[PDB]
């Protein structure tokens, strides 16, 4: 199950952790504390990207513009935000920024107060009302599925950002439409070589 | 003849023959190709 | 074109300098007899000057405001032969020399008194070693990968 | 085996065990065994490519000259227009060649490790020597004798020489290779390299 067949596995990575395939060319995981912190950061990044990607896909599928234009209203002085085509009455930069700062800071500081390394990655309890995590048999499978989907979401975000950089003011969906317009003409070729 | 070759193998004599040959090669190249500021072959 | 420069086949100061040099030579040419050897030498000098100016114009250089060519070491594709093409060549030759010398030193490290071989070079072994530097990049890369380039 | 120069002693590391060994190493590159193995694999693959390349750049010219097909020369193939842009074809080639060459490199580094099919686990390649995979790569199941290996190596060397000659003799004279041969056959004493340029 190694990432590259015929290549020896590292010592610290044996395959016990979910979604472990012995991939570490630069040897960044030698320090166990560093390995645990890296696991935490990777899980948080995966969860955020998983929550974010549909937030890009569902808009720009309706009449609303894209994930970039929805950000341009803050540049114009005295601008006001909109939601579902309706302008939010409380849409202005100072109040929005202050509310975001307060709420996010409180939530993150509450998160950081946990001490058990295992409880930080998988809190459990009140965070899962349905209760899929009671049975230990399916927990490993669910964890592996979550890790793989999170990595896929991270790759999706990288693709979104790079496609936006290549074509300013362009969404992923119109990019897919343009690619399907002529598969043998609109590819990565015209940008990789001028 | 052995010691003649040994003396001609000493450092100053070998150095002066080598430098004379190199200077002759450079001189002949500069005479064949008069002047050049860039490499136009490619 | 680049950095506010003028192509050398279009500038006027280039032609003015060429005319000045040609007139300076022709002023001295008049003194001697037309059939005499100094006349032939001065005619050869004039021909060389004209050929040099024509070659400089045809090679695609860029004169400046005052009229002299300017070299571009930037990395543009239109000036490959200005700095980059010669420079690589130099490195090759330079590497050759270094490689050869290093090899010779090792070839005399085995004996008990290498100083005698340093102050009195031997020609057979040196001639054997000299031509091994023609492929110096490959051998150097293989030695670097193997790890025998650095002492331990 | 044989000698590439009578009156010269062969180097010790070349013992004639390798296929196509004539003891030709005046500059002494293959002194270390690891370098010898790497250069053996290089001389295999480099040259297995060259034979196909030489055949591809030569045979169509002959066929066009005798008139069955009208095909552009090997130089003007790139200038011609195809069904798809050159960039997409280059990208496809880059990805596929990346995959196959990484597989081959992994095999060379760790022999007998990438024989198993990643998709269909049941299929596999029979064990053999590095550089001669055999198995599915040998549908007709020919005999991999030493004589066949020597023939292949000699043909590869001839292909190297042919490709270098093709490229340089087109560089000096813009005319194609087969037309160059025909011009030389028109009058050998006035159409050699020395007589013209
Ligand atoms: C395998 C080695 C290989 C070699 C030696 C060449 C060599 C050459 N190609 Mg080709 N090509 C090769 C593979 C490929 N070419 C092309 C696509 C092209 C194009 C699109 C063009 C060339 C052209 C040329 C010429 C460029 C000379 C110069 O830079 O001035 C030269 C004869 C040019 C040509 O047609 O004539 C100058 C040209 O513009 N090649 C592709 C697809 C990406 C290749 C894939 O392997
Ligand atoms: C995870 C973080 C995340 C973040 C930061 C954003 C951020 C944004 N969203 Mg997106 N979105 C997300 C996930 C996220 N979304 C998800 C998971 C979905 C699927 C339901 C959507 C679907 C979505 C829609 C349908 C719309 C946005 C819109 C917007 C913008 C308006 C914000 C606002 O007015 O809400 C205030 C909302 C309240 C009800 C306050 C309580 C804002 C830039 C708007 C946009 O498109 O702008 C033109 C909008 O119409 N989002
Ligand atoms: C996650 C999957 C993913 C998918 C499905 C797509 C899909 C698409 N890409 Mg995007 N892209 C991605 C990730 C992805 N991308 C990433 C990670 C990058 C950063 C390198 C890019 C950067 C990018 C560029 C620069 C371009 C596209 C374009 C396109 C379109 C045409 C593809 C093409 O011609 O060659 C694109 C080829 C590559 C970037 C290789 C992608 C292979 C993925 C990453 C493999 C991993 C996937 C998973 C294991 C299965 C197509 C809609 C092209 C477009 O403009 O279409 C009109 C275009 O020019 N993409
Ligand atoms: C060291 C190496 C060297 C080399 C390779 C050459 C090479 C050449 N010489 Mg030069 N030459 C050299 C040193 C060298 N010379 C020295 C030391 C002298 C002083 C005696 C000369 C004087 C000289 C004369 C007098 C002539 C050449 C000529 C030539 C050509 C001979 C055919 C060739 C370009 C001949 C030539 O090409 O003239 C046009 C010619 O006639 N050379
Ligand atoms: C024989 C080959 C040889 C080689 C491979 C090196 C290698 C090196 N030199 Mg040394 N060096 C040499 C001879 C050599 N040196 C000689 C003869 C002298 C006395 C003039 C020096 C004095 C010297 C100084 C003062 C410095 C170096 C430094 C360096 C290092 C950086 C490169 C550079 O700056 O070059 C510098 C090169 C020179 C100033 C001149 C070298 C040109 C000589 C004449 C060519 C070798 C020819 C030789 C006679 C060939 C005989 C072989 C033949 C019999 C087959 C590099 C490790 C630099 C450093 O320390 O880097 C860390 C530095 O500070 N070298
Ligand atoms: C293209 C690359 C290439 C490579 C990697 C090899 C590799 C090898 N050859 Mg082969 N060979 C080649 C082309 C090549 N050959 C060609 C074109 C011919 C016909 C002229 C031969 C004919 C040949 C003979 C007759 C013999 C070998 C032998 C060897 C082995 C030892 C010598 C060595 O270390 O070479 C390493 C070589 C290089 C790293 C290539 C460097 C090329 C430089 C950069 C340019 C050369 C200049 C060119 C004219 C321009 C080694 C496996 C010996 C053997 O024992 O085989 C089993 C042997 O006796 N070869
Ligand atoms: C080894 C690699 C190789 C490569 C890269 C090429 C490359 C090329 N060939 Mg050649 N060719 C090769 C070997 C090769 N050939 C061999 C072994 C033969 C058998 C003699 C031919 C005979 C051949 C024919 C008959 C034709 C080409 C043509 C072409 C072009 C179209 C490719 C295609 O459509 O598929 C392309 C430039 C086609 C073309 O139109 O060229 C301009 C075409 O008509 N090739
Ligand atoms: C004609 C020269 C030639 C020769 C003699 C060989 C010889 C050999 N090859 Mg190699 N090979 C060649 C070219 C050649 N190869 C090329 C161009 C490639 C790249 C496609 C390969 C790639 C290759 C692989 C992947 C494998 C071999 C293996 C073998 C061995 C068994 C096959 C056989 O007996 O071939 C006898 C060959 C002939 C009778 C040539 C017939 C002429 C053909 C039909 C010409 C088609 C050209 C036409 C004009 C268009 C044998 C040592 C196999 C092996 O060693 O298994 C253990 C194996 O694994 N070869
Ligand atoms: C492998 C065999 C080979 C063969 C059969 C040919 C055949 C041909 N060559 Mg090519 N050639 C080759 C390899 C080969 N070449 C190589 C390796 C090079 C690089 C130096 C060249 C470079 C070359 C040039 C520069 C010219 C030819 C030309 C020609 C033709 C005239 C022959 C002659 O005058 O000198 C050809 C032989 C050599 C220059 C060197 C020997 C080549 C190897 C060592 C022979 C075995 C002839 C049809 C001439 C022409 O245009 O014909 C009208 C011409 O001007 N060839
Ligand atoms: C692979 C190769 C050529 C491959 C060509 C290909 C694929 C061509 C493909 C195409 O044509 C087609 C099909 C169709 C066209 O439309 C497009 C192109 C793309 C043009 C050449 C190698 C060519 C390789 C060459 C010439 C190598 C020569 C090496 C020599 C002589 C080494 C000598 C020594 O190393 C020894 C042996 C021992 C040492 O001790 C001493 C020294 C002297 C160092």
Q: Quick check: A6 and D85 CB within 8 A?
A: no
Residue reference for tokens 């390349």? D53
Structure tokens at C44: 């050869």
Contacts of D70 (CB under 8 A, 6+ apart): D64
Give the nearest ligand 9 atom to D162 CA: 1
User: Rounded distance, CA D53 to CA D72, Å?
Assistant: 16
Q: Which of D130, D92, D99 is nearest to A4 (CA)?
A: D99
Are D53 and D163 in contact by the 8 Å Cβ rule? The answer is: yes
Residue C132, CA atoms < 13 Å, CB-side half-sphere: 22
Neighbours of A135 (CB within 10 A): 9
Residue in chain C closest to D35 (alpha carbons) equals: C142
Residues 6+ apart with CB under 8 A from A111: A120
Out of C48, C80, C120, closest to residue B34 by CB: C48
User: Which residue's entry shows tokens 């399916």?
Assistant: A138
**Atom 9 of ligand 6 has which residue's CA nearest to it?**
D43
Report the 10 Å Cβ neighbour count for C56. Answer: 20
Give the span between the Cα atoms of A178 and A190, in whole angstroms: 13
Task: Report how far residue C56's alpha carbon sits from residue C61's, in angstroms, rounded to the nearest whole number.
Answer: 7
C71 contacts C78 by C-beta, under 8 angstroms: no
Q: Are D18 and D40 in contact (CB under 8 A)?
A: yes
Please tell me the distance from the alpha carbon of residue A96 to that of residue A82, in angstroms, as a whole number.
13
Residue of chain A minimizing CA distance to D116: A5
Q: Work out the minimum CA distance from D52 to partner chain C, whole angstroms.
A: 26
Alpha helices in D11-138, H assignment, sequence order: 33-66, 86-109
Q: What Rg value do the Cα atoms of chain D yield, rounded?
A: 21
> How many Å from the N-terminal Cα to the C-terminal Cα in chain A?
40
- Please give the Cα distance from A120 to C65 (Å, whole number): 69
Residues 6+ apart with CB under 8 A from A177: none
State phi, psi for D39 to the nearest 5 degrees. -70, -30
Q: Please report the resolution in angstroms.
A: 3.3
Chain D: closest CA distance from residue A188 (Å): 7
Mutate to test the pocket of ligand 10, among D26, D50, D75, D89 (most ligand atoms within 8 A of CB): D50
Residue D125, C-beta contacts closer than 8 angstroms, at least 6 positions apart? D115, D133, D134, D135, D136
Annotate D12-30 with three-state secondary structure.
CCCCCCCCCCCCCCCCCCC
| Pairing outcome for strands A82-83 and A86-87 | antiparallel
The experimental method, as deposited, was cryo-EM
Using the Cα atoms of residue D133, residue D137, residue D141 and residue D142 in order, give the sign of their dihedral: negative
User: Which residues lie across from C62 on neighbouring strands?
Assistant: C7, C70
Q: C120, B6: Cβ pair inside 8 Å?
A: yes
CB atoms within 10 A of CB A160: 19
C121 and B11 within 8 Å at the Cβ level: the answer is: yes
Residue D21, both tokens? 């060994």
Q: How many CB pairs under 8 A join C and D?
A: 15
Q: Which is it for the CA torsion C35, C38, C39, C41, positive or negative?
A: positive
> Nearest-5° angle of CA A171, CA A176, CA A178?
95
Is D28 within 8 Å of C135 when comparing Cβ atoms?
no
With residue A67 as reference, give the H or E element that holds it: none
* CA-to-CA dists, residue C108 to C129, C134, D196, angstroms: 12, 21, 50
- Is residue A17 within 8 A of residue A122, CB to CB? The reply is no
Residue C25: count of CB within 10 angstroms of its CB: 14
Residue/partner pairs of A157-160 with CB below 8 Å, 24 or more apart: A157/A49, A157/A52, A157/A53, A160/A53, A160/A56, A160/A67
Q: Specify whether the CB–CB gap between A141 and A149 falls below 8 A.
A: no
D189 token code pair: 């004493």
Phi, psi of D64 (to 5 degrees): -65, -40
Among all ligands shown, which has an atom nearest to the Cα of D126? 8
DSSP result, C96-145: HHHHHHHHHHHHTTSSS-HHHHHHB--HHHHHHHHGGGGGHHHHHHHHHH
Q: CB distance A188–D91 less than 8 Å?
A: yes
Virtual CA dihedral for D59, D65, D68, D70, nearest 10 degrees?
90
SS3 content of chain A, % helix, strand, coil (to 5): 55, 0, 45
Q: Which of D88, D106, D114 sits opposite A184 (nearest CB)?
A: D88
Helix (H) or strand (E) holding A86: strand A86-87
Residue A30, helix vs strand vs coil: coil
Chain D CB within 8 Å of residue A187 CB = yes
């Amino acid at each position: 199950a190694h990432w590259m067949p015929g290549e020896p596995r590292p010592a610290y990575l044996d395959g016990s952790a979910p979604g472990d395939f012995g991939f570490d060319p630069l040897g960044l995981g030698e320090v166990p504390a560093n390995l645990e912190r890296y696991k935490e950061s990777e899980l948080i990044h995966c969860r955020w990207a998983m929550l974010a990607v549909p937030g890009i896909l569902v808009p720009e599928a309706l009449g609303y513009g894209n994930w970039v234009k929805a950000q341009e209203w803050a540049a114009l002085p005295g601008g006001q935000a909109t939601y579902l085509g309706n302008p939010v009455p409380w849409g202005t930069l100072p109040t929005i920024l202050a509310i975001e700062f307060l709420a996010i800071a409180f939530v993150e500081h509450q998160r950081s107060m946990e001490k058990d390394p295992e409880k930080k990655k998988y809190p459990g309890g009140a965070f899962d009302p349905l209760g899929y995590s009671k049975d230990p048999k399916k927990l490993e499978e669910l964890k592996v599925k979550e890790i793989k989907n999170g990595r896929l979401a991270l790759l999706a975000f990288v693709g979104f950002c790079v496609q936006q950089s290549a074509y300013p003011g362009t969404g992923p969906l119109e990019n897919l439409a343009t690619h399907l317009a002529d598969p043998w003409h609109n590819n990565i070729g015209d940008i990789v070589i001028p | 003849m052995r010691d003649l070759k040994t003396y001609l193998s000493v450092a100053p004599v070998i150095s002066t023959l080598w430098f004379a040959a190199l200077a002759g090669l450079l001189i002949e190249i500069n005479r064949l190709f008069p002047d050049a500021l860039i490499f136009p072959f490619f | 074109d680049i950095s506010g420069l003028t192509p050398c086949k279009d500038s006027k100061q280039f032609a003015k300098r060429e005319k000045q040099q040609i007139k300076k030579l022709e002023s001295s040419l008049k003194l001697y007899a037309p059939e005499s050897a100094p006349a032939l030498a001065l005619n050869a000098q004039i021909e060389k000057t004209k050929r040099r100016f024509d070659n400089y114009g045809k090679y695609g250089l860029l004169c400046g405001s005052d009229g002299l060519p300017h070299l571009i070491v930037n990395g543009d594709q239109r000036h490959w032969g200005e700095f980059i093409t010669p420079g690589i060549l130099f490195l090759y030759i330079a590497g050759w020399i270094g490689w050869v010398g290093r090899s010779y030193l090792i070839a005399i490290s085995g004996e008990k008194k290498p100083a005698m071989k340093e102050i009195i070079i031997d020609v057979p072994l040196a001639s054997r070693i000299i031509f091994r530097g023609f492929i110096w990049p490959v051998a150097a890369y293989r030695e670097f990968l193997n790890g025998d380039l650095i002492a331990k | 085996k044989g000698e590439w120069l009578p009156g010269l002693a062969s180097p010790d590391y070349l013992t004639g065990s390798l296929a196509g060994d004539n003891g030709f190493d005046p500059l002494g590159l293959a002194e270390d065994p690891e370098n010898l193995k790497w250069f053996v694999q290089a001389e295999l693959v480099h040259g297995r490519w060259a034979m196909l390349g030489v055949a591809g750049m030569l045979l169509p010219e002959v066929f066009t000259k005798i008139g069955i097909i009208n095909v552009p020369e090997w130089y003007d193939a790139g200038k011609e227009q195809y069904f798809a842009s050159s960039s997409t074809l280059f990208v496809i080639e880059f990805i596929l060649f990346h995959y196959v060459e990484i597989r081959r490199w992994q095999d060379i580094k760790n022999p007998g490790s990438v024989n198993q099919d990643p998709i269909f686990k049941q299929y596999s390649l029979p064990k053999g020597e590095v550089g001669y995979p055999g198995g599915i790569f040998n549908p007709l199941n020919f005999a991999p004798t030493q004589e066949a290996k020597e023939k292949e190596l000699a043909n590869g060397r001839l292909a190297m020489l042919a490709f270098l000659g093709f490229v340089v003799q087109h560089n000096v004279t813009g005319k194609g290779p087969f037309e160059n041969l025909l011009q030389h056959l028109s009058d050998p004493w006035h159409n050699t390299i020395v007589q013209t340029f």
